[model samples]
Each structure stands twice: as structure tokens, then as C-alpha cells.
Target: GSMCMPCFTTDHQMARRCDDCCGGRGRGRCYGPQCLCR
Candidate 1:
């Protein structure tokens, strides 16, 4: 199991559902498997 990962997936298509540095938009935008935070 993961930690604090309400939404976690290796596939970006799946991770996109999350609102964190690993996915979603805003302060963090996930590009593929990696995400850069603001």
C-alpha cells in the first residue's frame, strides 16, 4: 500500500485523477510519469 496517496498510479492516464504533484494541474502539472511542482 502507498502513503497519503489517495490517488496513485504509474500510468499518467490513471494518475491524472489525482490533485497532487504527481498529477492534475495548478501548482503541479504531471507530464507523463513525472510531475513538477510550483
Candidate 2:
């Protein structure tokens, strides 16, 4: 299980799905400005 929180960049830009979230483990979804991954 992963309690992975949303990963943000320097300017608070939503990072790419395979970049910030999950480290390319799985596709991540964005909740507002947050990225949630499994």
C-alpha cells in the first residue's frame, strides 16, 4: 500500500503523471492541485 501524497514542483506546477506521482508505478489522478497515486 502507498500513502503517497501529491508531489509538487518548485513553482507548484502539477508534475507529469509518470514523473512525480508513483515514480511511474501507475497512472496518477489529480485532485485539484494534488496528485494521488496507488
Winning candidate number (lDDT):
2
TM-score per candidate: 0.31, 0.34
Cα lDDT computed for each candidate against the true fold: 0.43, 0.52
Off by over 4 Å in 1: 1-25
- Using TM-score as the measure, the top candidate is 2
Task: Predict model 2's lDDT versus the native.
Answer: 0.52
Q: Where is the poorest 10-residue window by lDDT in model 2?
A: 10-19
Residue 38, model 1: Cα distance from true site in angstroms: 3.8
Instruction: Give the C-alpha miss distance for residue 24 in model 1, angstroms.
Output: 11
lDDT of 2 by residue, 1-38 (tens): 24355544654445465245557644565554456664
lDDT of 2 at 29: 52
lDDT of 1: 0.43
In candidate 1, what are the lDDT values of residues 1-38, reduced to their tens digit? 22223433646453444445444455454444444443
What TM-score does candidate 2 reach? 0.34
